[PDB]
Design a binder for this molecule. Structure first.
Ligand SMILES: *[C@@H]1O[C@H](CO)[C@@H](O)[C@H](O)[C@H]1NC(C)=O
Ligand SMILES: *[C@@H]1O[C@H](CO)[C@@H](O)[C@H](O)[C@H]1NC(C)=O
Ligand SMILES: *[C@@H]1O[C@H](CO)[C@@H](O)[C@H](O)[C@H]1NC(C)=O
Lengths: 118, 109, 188, 86, 103, 118
């Protein structure tokens, strides 16, 4: 399974950016999908994830309110939208996959990543 | 192998029993079947499962097996009941195979 | 799937690359019963028993249920073969430069029929493959229940497909349990 | 003193496909698709075809001077033509 | 809320619900495989427009219309029958899963 | 069910002969098929048999090594090949069918037979 992100973006403070992740294989997946980010010189931070079939979405308390994760199943795509951008949002973003249908601490496949600069 | 008398004869309308003595490996541990062969034709099954008859076989044919020896009995003999008769069984010890009897000629008078 | 154009008595042309039909069981090479896996020591049938008593132990095959399973599978395969008819001579046509609409209609007809028949064949194989495996599982379960409904209280079920006798019984008892005629009152 | 119920297994490596599952190993199976040929034009129940060679249908039926050898053949099982006859 | 099958337990320290993560995973695997197979068996449509005929070409027009109508009927029948037949097997599958967990 | 053999053969010592048996009905059978032979003035002799689905083949110790039995299921045919012919191989051959899938001592349907002379 390969995960491919969209292109890089250059945004202005106060704007919003939407990114997409595409997964190879059948359009419908039996595993959850999560979004992670990393700033230069810092460690990874978990943003939120989405669950198949049920459609439940979970977010992090730091990012709760500003981020929205959606999925489109017949094309096999996952979208993440972030709003109210600041200078500290400049980071590299990855979409990662889990082994099961639940969002847990173990992710076995990661994407290349895409950079968002403000 | 299975041993049978080479020839038995009797008058029409009588009763004839054909025997066959094998061993504990062939007949003493397996079932026996009886076939009839007319001249110029393939053998025809007469008795299977040691007492059973297929469809189309008349009631005057019967079979039994005691210990090592099996017996085929025919009553109401006609002119058309003169042919070869064979006993067959499924030998099984070193390499299992079907074994036929020596054959018995039934002559009517 | 060699060529659409054929002359003589030929099979039907499809776009598929694989069409395989299962006739046997799942291959799970794992002494315990059917709950763990299959037996490589049983070779003369599909379902059977393993017995262990004072005079020894060994495998045997149930000749009765295997016969019905084989009858059903053979009937299914024969029906699948019969429902599809053989292809006869079918070659192409030719058109000149002012007859493009007729050529396009001919191509449309050919492509549509090919699509429909490919879909039919693939769907039929996929749908029969599951029913075969369900059939085999049901047969094994029925054999287990038939054996369990004959010993009652004289045996203990240890939960892996095996039964342990409370009394002691020799080869005749085993050959009678594997027979369908077991005397419950005799050993009560 | 113990009796157990079980089924068959071997060392087959054939696989089949299902709606609910893919790539399942089984003990016995059959193949329903043929994908091989010999690569030659061959007789059809003892009757040989008619081969045109350089000629087309028009040249064969009109009497092209280069198609003389086809005059003597008056029976066939099918007709074979060249992709670009001359 | 976190699964399809599960348990409810009650003991001296309290009571609560829980979901069996194991059987739900196989159920999801099977359902996803089935939906993907259904999607794959049907191919996408490409460009397909109509033709035109003059007044002395009515038989060709009628043949074209017949071909179009026949193909449309066959594909509608196929789609409806496939959906109707899979809907029952899904529910039987779920019932069998619950029974297996109970046993 | 009708079983039809092939034609008669005239062979030379040291050669090999292959014969075929065709069974009426569906191409796939649920019963085993055996080959029997009989010399003039003698009794029948069992050669070997083949089992459906499983494909197991059994032979007789007298004929083991020289005879080969094969089957083709999509045409419903059974082939028997014999090699290293001698003068005593001159006999009439039958293909016979059993009631079950196992090779046993009871055969209920026989063929007409075909003669092999050396
Ligand atoms: C097994 O069954 C057969 C027929 O059903 C019977 O003749 C035979 O005596 C039985 N064997 C035992 C050990 O009961
Ligand atoms: C494995 O299969 C081959 C036939 O392809 C044969 O050697 C035998 O049946 C099997 N051997 C073992 C050791 O399983
Ligand atoms: C066909 O044309 C070729 C030209 O390459 C020529 O060599 C050949 O002799 C012609 N005839 C046949 C029968 O091939």
């Amino acid at each position: 399974v390969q995960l491919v992100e969209s292109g890089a973006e250059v945004k202005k403070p106060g704007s919003s950016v939407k990114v997409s992740c595409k997964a190879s294989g059948g359009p419908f997946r039996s595993y959850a999908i999560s979004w992670v980010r990393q700033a230069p010189g810092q460690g990874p931070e978990w943003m939120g994830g989405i669950i198949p079939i049920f459609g439940t979405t979970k977010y992090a308390p730091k990012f709760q309110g500003r981020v929205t994760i959606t999925a489109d199943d017949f094309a096999g795509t996952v979208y993440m939208e972030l709003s109210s951008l600041r200078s500290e949002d400049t980071a590299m973003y990855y979409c990662a996959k889990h082994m099961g249908y639940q969002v847990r601490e173990t992710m076995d496949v990661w994407g290349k990543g895409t950079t968002v600069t403000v | 192998v299975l041993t049978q008398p080479p020839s038995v004869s009797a008058a029409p309308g009588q009763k004839v029993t054909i025997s066959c003595s094998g061993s504990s490996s062939n007949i003493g541990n397996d079932y026996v079947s009886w076939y009839q062969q007319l001249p110029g034709t393939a053998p025809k099954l007469l008795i299977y499962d040691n007492n059973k008859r297929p469809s189309g076989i008349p009631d005057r044919f019967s079979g039994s097996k005691s210990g090592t020896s099996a017996t085929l009995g025919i009553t109401g003999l006609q002119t058309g009941d003169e042919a070869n008769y064979y006993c067959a069984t499924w030998d099984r010890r070193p390499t299992a195979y079907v074994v036929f009897g020596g054959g018995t000629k039934l002559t009517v008078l | 799937n060699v060529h659409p154009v054929t002359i003589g008595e030929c099979p039907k042309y499809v776009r598929s690359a694989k069409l395989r039909m299962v006739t046997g069981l799942r291959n799970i090479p794992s002494i315990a019963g059917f709950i763990e896996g299959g037996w490589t020591g049983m070779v003369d049938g599909w379902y059977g028993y393993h017995h262990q008593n004072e005079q020894g132990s060994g495998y045997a095959a149930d000749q009765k249920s295997t016969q019905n399973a084989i009858n059903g599978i053979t009937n299914k395969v024969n029906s699948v073969i019969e429902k599809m008819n053989t292809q006869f001579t079918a070659v192409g046509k030719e058109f000149n430069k002012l007859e493009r609409r007729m050529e396009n209609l001919n191509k449309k007809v050919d492509d549509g029929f090919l699509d429909i028949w490919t879909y039919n064949a693939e769907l039929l194989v996929l749908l029969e493959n599951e029913r075969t495996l369900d059939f085999h599982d049901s047969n094994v379960k029925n054999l287990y229940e038939k054996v369990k409904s004959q010993l009652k209280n004289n045996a203990k079920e240890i939960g892996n497909g095996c039964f342990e006798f409370y009394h002691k019984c020799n080869n005749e008892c085993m050959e009678s349990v594997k027979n369908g005629t077991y005397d419950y009152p005799k050993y009560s | 003193d113990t009796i157990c119920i079980g089924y068959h297994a071997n060392n087959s490596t054939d696989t089949v496909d299902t709606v609910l599952e893919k790539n399942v190993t089984v003990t016995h199976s059959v193949n329903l698709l043929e994908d091989s040929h010999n690569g030659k034009l061959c007789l059809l129940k003892g009757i040989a075809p008619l081969q045109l060679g350089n000629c087309s249908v028009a040249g064969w039926i009109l009497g092209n001077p280069e198609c003389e050898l086809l005059i003597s053949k008056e029976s066939w099982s099918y007709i074979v033509e060249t992709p670009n006859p001359e």
